Amino acid sequence: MGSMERASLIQKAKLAEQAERYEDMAAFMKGAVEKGEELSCEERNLLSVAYKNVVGGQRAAWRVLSSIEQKSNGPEVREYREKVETELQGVCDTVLGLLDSHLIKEAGDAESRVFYLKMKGDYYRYLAEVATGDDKKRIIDSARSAYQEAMDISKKEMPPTNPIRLGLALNFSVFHYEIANSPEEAISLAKTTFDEAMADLHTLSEDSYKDSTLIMQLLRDNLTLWT
């Protein structure tokens, strides 16, 4: 994408989303990041939407194949699960590489830095979902460390209803439950997040209230599933 203007890549990412062409969307956003400039709030959301949808489809396919493989236990199911797994790892490595070169280091405002560290935690979490080898513990710890740094900044710099702070807590709680084998930590985090957001809703406008309550409902949905 080196020969395409930044603004054209952003415009085409928006078109790709409307056309449900998420692989294209992600490629356009990778090209935009590689222009080297910081991303605005809207552009950060395009980057996240694109890769979350690409890896989300890979994760769903990996889970279908992993289920078939486990029931089976010729080489074909394992080979094909491995192929999908390698592709998934490649996309996660690409996102992590964009964050490391150089989105995080240039992000000084709390909103941008938390957003990118939340992404970093998420893509290490997706790597941890498929990990089995000598580095699996280190992948889990890399997710934990990114989420923890994001949490520390969010608690110092953002109100408890801020949607990025809430989504971060939601995802870190999923990490605790599904990756770290820490269901109590997951439940505690989701509960305290929900309750502290509830107590700050009175400060919000109607549109901000809608955003915060939407994520609070996701927290509540998980708590209902986990308890």
Binding site: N45, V49, K52, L170, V174, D211, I215, N222, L225, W226
Partner: peptide, 9 residues
């Protein structure tokens, strides 16, 4: 369970 979606929908 569920993580954050990309869009509010």
């Amino acid at each position: 369970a569920g993580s954050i979606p990309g869009r509010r929908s």
